[PDB]
Design a protein around this nucleic acid. Sequence first.
DNA 1: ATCAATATCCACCTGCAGATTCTACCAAAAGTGTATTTGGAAACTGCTCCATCAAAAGGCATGTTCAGCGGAATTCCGCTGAACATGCCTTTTGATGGAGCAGTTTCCAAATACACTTTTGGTAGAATCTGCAGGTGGATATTGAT
DNA 2: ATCAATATCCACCTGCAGATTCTACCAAAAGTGTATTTGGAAACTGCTCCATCAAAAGGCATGTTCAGCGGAATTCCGCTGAACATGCCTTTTGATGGAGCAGTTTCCAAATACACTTTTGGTAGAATCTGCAGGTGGATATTGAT
Lengths: 97, 97, 274, 79, 80, 98, 108, 230, 93, 95, 23, 75
Amino acid sequence: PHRYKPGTVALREIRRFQKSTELLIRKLPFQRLVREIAQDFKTDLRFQSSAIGALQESVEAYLVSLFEDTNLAAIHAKRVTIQKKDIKLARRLRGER
Amino acid sequence: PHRYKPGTVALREIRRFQKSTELLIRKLPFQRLVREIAQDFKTDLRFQSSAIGALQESVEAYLVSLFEDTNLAAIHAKRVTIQKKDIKLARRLRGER
Amino acid sequence: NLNRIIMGKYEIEPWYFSPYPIELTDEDFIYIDDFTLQYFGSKKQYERYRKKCTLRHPPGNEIYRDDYVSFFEIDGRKQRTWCRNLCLLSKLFLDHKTLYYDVDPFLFYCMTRRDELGHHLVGYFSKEKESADGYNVACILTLPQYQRMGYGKLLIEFSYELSKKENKVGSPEKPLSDLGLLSYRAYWSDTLITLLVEHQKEITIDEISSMTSMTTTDILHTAKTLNILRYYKGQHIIFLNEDILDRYNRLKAKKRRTIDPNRLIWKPPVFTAS
Amino acid sequence: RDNIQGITKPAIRRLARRGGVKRISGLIYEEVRAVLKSFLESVIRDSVTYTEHAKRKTVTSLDVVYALKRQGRTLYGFG
Amino acid sequence: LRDNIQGITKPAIRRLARRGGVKRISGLIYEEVRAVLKSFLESVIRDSVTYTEHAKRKTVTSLDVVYALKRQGRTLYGFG
Amino acid sequence: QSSSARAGLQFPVGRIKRYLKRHATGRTRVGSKAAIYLTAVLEYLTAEVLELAGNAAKDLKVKRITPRHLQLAIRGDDELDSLIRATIASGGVLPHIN
Amino acid sequence: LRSQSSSARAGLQFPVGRIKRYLKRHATGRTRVGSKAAIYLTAVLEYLTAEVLELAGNAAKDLKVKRITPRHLQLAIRGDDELDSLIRATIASGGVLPHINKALLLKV
Amino acid sequence: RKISVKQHLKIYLPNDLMTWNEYDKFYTGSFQETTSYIKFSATVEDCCGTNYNMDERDETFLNEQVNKGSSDILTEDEFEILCSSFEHAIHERQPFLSMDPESILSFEELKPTLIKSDMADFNLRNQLNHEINSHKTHFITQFDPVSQMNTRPLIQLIEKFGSKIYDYWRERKIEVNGYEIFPQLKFERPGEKEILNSQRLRALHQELKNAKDLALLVAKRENVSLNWIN
Amino acid sequence: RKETYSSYIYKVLKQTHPDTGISQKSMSILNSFVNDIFERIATEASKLAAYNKKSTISAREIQTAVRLILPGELAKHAVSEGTRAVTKYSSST
Amino acid sequence: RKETYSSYIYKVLKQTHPDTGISQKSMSILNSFVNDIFERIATEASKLAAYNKKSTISAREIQTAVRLILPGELAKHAVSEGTRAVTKYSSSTQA
Amino acid sequence: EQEDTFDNLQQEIYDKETEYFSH
Amino acid sequence: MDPSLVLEQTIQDVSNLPSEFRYLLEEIGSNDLKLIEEKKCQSLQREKCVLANTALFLIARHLNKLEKNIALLEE
DNA sequence: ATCAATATCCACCTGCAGATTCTACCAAAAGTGTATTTGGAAACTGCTCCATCAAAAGGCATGTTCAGCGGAATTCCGCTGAACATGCCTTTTGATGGAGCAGTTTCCAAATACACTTTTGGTAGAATCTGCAGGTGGATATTGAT
DNA sequence: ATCAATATCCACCTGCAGATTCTACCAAAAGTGTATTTGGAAACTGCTCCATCAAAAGGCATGTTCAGCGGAATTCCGCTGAACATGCCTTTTGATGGAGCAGTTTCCAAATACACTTTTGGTAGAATCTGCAGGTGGATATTGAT
């Protein structure tokens, strides 16, 4: 019935999820999402397993890059919260349209 | 003497340089600058005048792009002015390497 | 070696050979003074010159006077004769220089010791009005008239706050001689340990070269002589070796006489002619 | 069918937890799904063009690592 | 030999920034925007002088600058 | 008679065929694949060309300066992506206030 | 020792004729040097020896005698000049390098 | 092997696994020091001045051979003062003596020249000493040592005994071939061992004689003090 | 010897609204425009036919290279116009 | 039927450090690395020889390719070792 | 008579020190 | 020969002529305060009138060549 | 501060995938030997175009100044997220049934290479036309103090 | 709500250099038809490899509560835009001067290309060896209750 300081085990999951290297997004929902976005170009797009693993890896790399981007933007805003507009300025200055 | 509100002739010159297509940086000190930044890489080598204009145009374009996105970071940070943390966020987020 | 140099109190047969005897391949002694240091192989021209003594400080401005020494600045165009007089003095002691022009262009920084009898100019180095090598020391010499005391190191302490105010980095030239070979590396090393016993946070190679203004092609090569630079632990690691533990303690329990960066009456001079 | 909401909240919490953030807003989930789906169409289009030019009715790893190369986000290890 | 500090060009930073859409400037950015300028300049100038060194030529053309900026990722356009 | 009008365009089929020959690495291309290609650059030039009839009723500029080329090549926002590689020489910027 | 070589006259551990043919299959122009593509043999040999010298730098982090992918990112991202020669690349199953931004941690 | 680069870190602790004797009659006197450090701007030739000394070889005919029954007290100072005067004085009116000191020219055509001489304007003071009116004393400097309150000037010995000073001066210039007896240096060459005037600087005279008329009454603001004592 | 697409661009301008006039610096920037898009689709076409193990630089690889080199809607009406041109060429023997 | 570089990477590693292993995930990493940096420097040499109005890719354009496409200090190391090996190839004597 | 020159020159300093050295 | 160089040598020796003018008169005024409490008896005014007699000598030695540049250039 | 309380790290059994190597066979090349055309070192030689050089006019650079206002700070006020705990939907991890990838063949339409003829795309000569830079003189937005 | 000087728009206008629209010419490659290779279109199968269905367990959904953390007010003041008045480097603008280009011609290394041939680096797979990922016991690092 005891708990530590509320708000500091976020540091614990910072450390234990940067020490590791496994993929985060679970494989079957990601396969379903990539097939959902595959169906509305062309029906019956058969896939390769390592292909969708590569999709997962590229997704993880792009999302973690955008996440350290919005981290630096929000901490420039003198603020620990990341908002909508933190991601908005991160994407708009990163170069995407 | 008659003097306006401090801030509105800034808006007037914003409008004038939005309409303007003038080359902003003067040719002679920038030309001597590209001379003195080229001579340490190789001793005396000739410059063609159109190449000076080319360096001029590229540097002005990169500087105004950097000023636009540091302005967007500056209005993100709830200020109307710019300082070193704005230009540093602009440089890191644009990814110079 | 020619007809041992007697001056002040210390007699010197010189380390090197002969820039001097165009009209002097005949004598048995050479007398040198302290302020003019007017070369006088004869005696009667020398003792009459000491009854013609007026100068009791070398011809320039001062910028230091600590408890032990003082520092000067004497430019070679404003003194024709005197600056070339002590060009003779070091060349009898150090042969790695040039007489190839009767040396005008550069500035002398020279150092004495205070006596109520009079100062005695006891070491110098030249300084040219140009930065090709960086040039913060051109031709240093502690002289064996009075060598055996570590104030010759203090010329290298004096060397670098020059580069602090002048705000351009520098290192001495390529003909390093053996008496300075041991001396240069001892000050490059012992300044590296000072800014690492302070500065508890991370250190880039720009602002070792800006905080202390040793050039990077020297200060990396002196960090590797210290063996303070090891890789293979996630960065290039600085890594205390336990001989640090006495060596910050060496200048904090066996403290030395030093300089200060604030007591400088000097402005960097602006130049028209070249 | 509708499964962009499948990429759940603790997964994106951990994925931002690798990025080094601290304070997740309660509605950053929607636009991180939006930027996810945007990157997905930008990679799935040129994967479909490479597999359709190759007359190949399955999608290999090599065509999507080529399409990921051309967009400018090249991947090493899978090709 | 002009190895002098004409890296202090000009405070038309308040003319280029007015070509940008920014209001007031708050000073001290002048030094680091000159630092950005110097980094950008030597980055382009190294590539241009490698092109004119490979050409065995002792001048740079506009073509050399266009080719260097072409590889650089920011292509100057309609100059040669 | 000439091969340029026989596909119904104005750009030369025969010249740009030779350009792809000097830009080749697979050594071989059909003359018919220039025909799809020569009208791609015809389409992609004409699409930029007709949209610099931008404001010409209220300023009546019957020539065009180079910012007349730029100050609508960005408003054609699909063509912003295909020319984001470009920096227009003496072009200025769009009038926009944050 | 012998009068026959496999073009081993570079102090090299790479195939000469293979990347000769691979330069031949980029074939924009017409003619490629054979005797002086060897500088390009040892070009690839140079930055690959350095990349694997970096793997022995971090094989001894953890007393781990093989080499894997997440701490091949860890070497390629901590050399600064090899970083930007690989910054477009994302090493798969690599993790990230641990950098807590210092303005976040306030000892709370 | 490579050379390191920027941005890097620092990890200090965590767990990795003949003293000469005859100098006393040379250097005498004390020397004060001021809380303002010294500022100096003069040359070393003006700190020595009379640029000739005469050695043991010729003092022995002047000190203990002239002074047997010489009526005028002919001391060794003017033996160096007057001799060094025409070491100079012949050379600015004959600059080509080097190839022939058999061309040692005669005083019987030098006799009006060195009498009216102003050796690079050597007596620059006495015309301005008029303005301070210190001809009761002479002009003394810190560039002058303590041995010139008793000296006597030049012209009233040249017709007296200075006719018999250039006599011995001549013959040891031919054995040295027309140069100084402890010769000058390797000076011959650096060879081997052994509209802008019109607008702003048109007042450069006015810039500094504001201090020259200031200089004498700030020299009189102490010359109201060394007649205060009398 | 000189080489430019300039008079081609002039007849483009008269094929559209013809009463107007190009300036000869804007002509150079239109030249660099069509030259740059030529370079991009040429290197992408060569790379595509390279790693898809063919030899003939064909028409459908230009079709797929222009479908992936351009943004969406201008790509689809560009590929429509290009196919119309290649069909009206191939229909005459 | 496939050609790869994997044994060459392996013999490079074992001639640098004789006892160190490689996972084939990392072998694919390094193979993709060398293949991509090959394609980059080859297209640089090809376009440089193209617009410099020459007809043969030689040691000077691949030398300026290794200069232009690498950042500074390892580019200097690369051109030094490249000149070393290309003069060791020219040394064709009896022994 | 040693001081009847002291009583007039002392203002010529300030008349000169406020002439050029005090603008 | 030229006005661009006649201002040269006369401004760096009168760069440090205001050094001694900001040095030499101040030290003459340093010891004369003791002569208010002098009320050394016959010789300490002798030394201070010597090293302020030098205050008008070193500024005097520039003058002999100073005015001839004004005449020999404008002739 | 002084222990509680986890959870980080560390040292140590163990059960395999997993490098890995060594043979070993071998389809596919690499080094060699030697004709064979051609790209290139580079050598001389106009000459274009940059490099200084300078002289007057002059728009703009740069202190020095002021007024006020937009940024750093403190405090507090309300709330939106972090954090257990209980429950659970969903997935991970295991098993069997059919299509197109890859590979191997055939033949014909298309591209390479060549010797030809003829127009296109280029100047440069520049006459000629005239649209834009810049000018300037009435009506018309447009803001600070009252 | 209002004065009123400051600066803008627009029609009309004068210069002039820039575009254009030719003829000469001109020549250098595009278009024509032939003939031989040749790789692409296509039809064929062999068989992996990709679709899809059933048990434990685990991380995921959703609460309730606590509370540091956005965020808004108010304040105060450094600092910063707007101006005057003055210099000063710039901007022409000739105007001359010299020195690396870009050719034309030039005579040789050298890569190409053919046939040959002997290793050789791909791969198969099996051995066997084990490094390391997985699990367990335990010192201890860091930090919450009062």
